[PDB]
């Protein structure tokens, strides 16, 4: 008798299974061969890799148990089985999970407020606002903007910075309520998030 052994290309390289992968999907099919053309039992083990994979017995389907989440965990590494029923040969495959945009920015630093002067200069820089996307590529890289739009300040939508565009006035008005948005660059499915500033003006 001569023991079966694993074909697939993941065993050298590595599996990519994208995080969206829904429940229930099959991931991949473990392929082997055994030069005596015997029937193959196909399996899983690890406390871990069985929580997160099953593998049909007969087939060699590996499918998802559990949701994957790149930005809790990014890779694992996976032992299958196969046995002849005779000998039982494990061998490890590598798994990288696959970005997809499914995190909005996060704001950091809040509550953000800050007191300014009313003679403050047409151009004066008076805040800066951060938030970061763990998200890859275009998910994952942040635009600024307040919505709506001010007629009195603006907001540079790479880096984050309130600069004063117009003359204030503190007869007229004291605080301002101003809404940021952070919005991610996913060409099909941008999220964002909100953050209030609050401008008061001072004499
Ligand atoms: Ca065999
Ligand atoms: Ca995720
Ligand atoms: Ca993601
Ligand atoms: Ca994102
Ligand atoms: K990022």
């Given at each position: 008798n001569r023991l079966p052994y694993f074909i697939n290309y993941f065993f050298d390289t590595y599996l990519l299974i994208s995080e969206d992968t829904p429940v229930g999907s099959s991931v991949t099919?473990?392929?082997?061969?055994?030069m005596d053309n015997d029937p193959l039992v196909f399996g899983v083990?690890?406390?871990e890799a069985s929580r997160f994979?099953?593998?049909?017995?007969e087939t060699g389907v590996?499918?998802?148990r559990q949701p994957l989440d790149r930005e809790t965990?990014?890779?694992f590494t996976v032992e299958f089985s196969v046995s002849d029923s005779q000998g039982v040969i494990t061998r490890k495959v590598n798994i990288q999970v696959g970005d997809v945009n499914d995190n909005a920015p996060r704001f950091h630093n809040q509550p953000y407020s800050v007191r300014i002067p009313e003679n403050t200069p047409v151009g004066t820089p008076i805040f800066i606002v951060n938030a970061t996307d763990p998200d890859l590529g275009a998910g994952g890289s942040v635009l600024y903007s307040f919505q709506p739009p001010s007629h009195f300040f603006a907001i540079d939508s790479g880096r984050g910075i309130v600069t004063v565009i117009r003359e204030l006035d503190y007869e007229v008005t004291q605080a301002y309520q101003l809404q940021v948005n952070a919005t991610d660059q996913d060409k099909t499915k941008p999220?964002?998030?909100?953050a209030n500033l609050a401008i008061t003006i001072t004499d």
């Open positions: 099919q473990l392929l082997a061969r055994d083990s690890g406390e994979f099953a593998v049909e017995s590996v499918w998802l965990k990014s890779e999220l964002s998030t909100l």
